[PDB]
Amino acid sequence: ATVLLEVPFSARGDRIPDAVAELRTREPIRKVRTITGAEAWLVSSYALCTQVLEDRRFSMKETAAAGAPRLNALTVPPEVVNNMGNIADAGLRKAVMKAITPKAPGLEQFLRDTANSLLDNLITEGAPADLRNDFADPLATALHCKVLGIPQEDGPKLFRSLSIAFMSSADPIPAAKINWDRDIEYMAGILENPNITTGLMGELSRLRKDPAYSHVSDELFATIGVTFFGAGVISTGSFLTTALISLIQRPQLRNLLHEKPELIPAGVEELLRINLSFADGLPRLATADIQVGDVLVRKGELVLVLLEGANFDPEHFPNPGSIELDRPNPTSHLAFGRGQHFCPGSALGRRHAQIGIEALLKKMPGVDLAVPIDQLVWRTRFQRRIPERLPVLW
């Protein structure tokens, strides 16, 4: 006698389980059990993943409803699941999206300077170096302090909330509320701090005192800062970390991008496509009865959109495990989602990874793992897949 298939399948972020391909072929939508004990529909083909993400009747905000089947416990207030919707309703979407583009004057130069300084420090200390804790994550943190307009020295403390904030837990997490409340208090103080005049928080601080926004809540302004810092830092840091592994595992790609750095954007796009940083499918709750493939999903049921299901689907990306810089459909992957909730930080995430990789390949052309790849320790019960340390030599 066998139990219902459990998700997630593996916390390892360096390879996709052979099981995903068998599942996509045989049952591209099928029932699974989540860590909470709830049942859910796991969707694993490109066609069905796109269908779900483009149909707003599969709702993100409704996943936070009391009594719904859950992928994991909330680590944020329930109203925060609707964060982008609240931003839009407050009239703040254009201003927020403008503040988080990589086009702001000096931002890209700051990123390059920061990456080079981090790498110089590692070279001075000598191999082995930890490219997650001493490169990718500090680069992500520095970037988001700059984007938010907050002091660089405040980055590390905000960062240390994230190993709990992005847990994927069966049960509520007491530490998540402690850190959330503290970080909200911090951002509320930032909005009242007259020295904060640049970046996203500088812009929100101005709009907060503009008569057109006088009824927008101080809670929402603070929440934007906390959530954009957290989502951005965890997403860019984790993506860059696992992209570096994928590059290290491919010496000839590493050498091609070192020799022809103009190919780095196309390389980053393929690294995004094959990336396994999202540890769970994207959750949606059905608000109606909806046919998805051979399954009639019923109102109130949980659907999980498996990004690597779509992104390794050979019907859409032939030879899907191979990084090919000349695909005809290179940005059509789902690494940033699709539809209503498409990632607002997609351009910034691309530039973070492009600049980080360019800098690493220039400073450490001989970069290689300093331990056998099986020795990487993969974080469990987390919303991202990441190795606890990434030891390299060069």
Give whichever of 2 and 272 is closer to ligand HEM, judged by the CB atom.
Answer: 272
Determine the interface stretch with ligand HEM among 173-181, 292-300, 338-346, 380-388 (rule: CB under 6 A). Answer: 338-346
Partner from ligand HEM, ligand KE5, none binding residue 236, C-beta < 5-8 Å depending on class: ligand HEM
Question: What is the distance in angstroms between the CA of the first residue and the CA of the last residue of the chain?
Answer: 51
Partner from ligand KE5, ligand HEM, none binding residue 335, C-beta < 5-8 Å depending on class: ligand HEM
Q: Cis peptide leading into 318, omega within 30 of 0?
A: no
Spatial separation of the C-alpha atoms in residues 307 and 275, rounded to whole Å: 9
The tokens describing 300, both together, are 């109130």
Site string (45-84) toward ligand HEM, x via CB under 6 A: ---------------x-----------------------x
Site string (72-101) toward ligand KE5, x via CB under 6 A: ---xx------x------------------
Q: Cis peptide leading into 8, omega within 30 of 0?
A: yes
Q: Looking at this protein, which amino acid is placed at residue 385? A: R
C-beta of residue 118 within 8 angstroms of C-beta of residue 133:
no
The tokens describing 226, both together, are 């906390």
**Which of 138, 199, 225, 230 contacts ligand KE5 by CB under 6 A?**
230
**Which of 226, 271, 303, 323 contacts ligand KE5 by CB under 6 A?**
226
Q: Which residue has the tokens 């689907």?
A: 313
Partner from ligand HEM, ligand KE5, none binding residue 268, C-beta < 5-8 Å depending on class: none
Our measurement of the distance from residue 391's CA atom to the centroid of its chain's CA atoms, rounded to an integer in Å, reads 22
The tokens describing 50, both together, are 């796109």
C-beta of residue 391 within 8 angstroms of C-beta of residue 370:
yes
SS3 60: coil
Determine the interface stretch with ligand HEM among 12-20, 130-138, 156-164, 336-344 (rule: CB under 6 A). Answer: 336-344
- Considering only residues 340 to 359 of the shown chain, the ones binding ligand HEM according to CB under 6 A are 341, 343-345, 348-349
- Considering only residues 95 to 114 of the shown chain, the ones binding ligand HEM according to CB under 6 A are 100
